[PDB]
Design a protein around this ligand. Sequence first.
Ligand SMILES: O=P(O)(O)O[C@H]1[C@H](O)[C@@H](OP(=O)(O)O)[C@H](OP(=O)(O)O)[C@@H](OP(=O)(O)O)[C@H]1O
Length: 117
Amino acid sequence: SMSDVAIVKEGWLHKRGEYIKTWRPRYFLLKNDGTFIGYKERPQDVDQREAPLNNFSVAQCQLMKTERPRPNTFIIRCLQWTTVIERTFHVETPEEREEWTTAIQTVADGLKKQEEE
Ligand SMILES: O=P(O)(O)O[C@H]1[C@H](O)[C@@H](OP(=O)(O)O)[C@H](OP(=O)(O)O)[C@@H](OP(=O)(O)O)[C@H]1O
């Protein structure tokens, strides 16, 4: 129960709009249960934590590193209920990008091992 809701990684990034393709600052949090949740403002209390702006599930996701429109961009391709979506993110160095994509992949792998169990 508690290991599943551990926070694996959290931090700020920019998230690109889907239609108005601007970079928007968002605070994201990845948990062992595959939830990847974003906030306009970094949450300061539990109530704030419970009300994210963005919520994805990273089970079986794909992780793509790209250099356009900006270097150090990454794309997650994941399932949102029954629709496959892509979301685009940016951090300021390739090392930071690798930290995020590896953490997301580690969580996804964990969920897969749980299934296989
Ligand atoms: O603002 P524009 O360019 O019109 O497009 C919006 C933003 O990309 C939202 O991201 P953000 O909340 O980070 O601004 C996104 O929310 P999600 O990424 O949470 O899905 C909306 O998807 P919808 O969820 O389909 O509304 C999408 O329609």
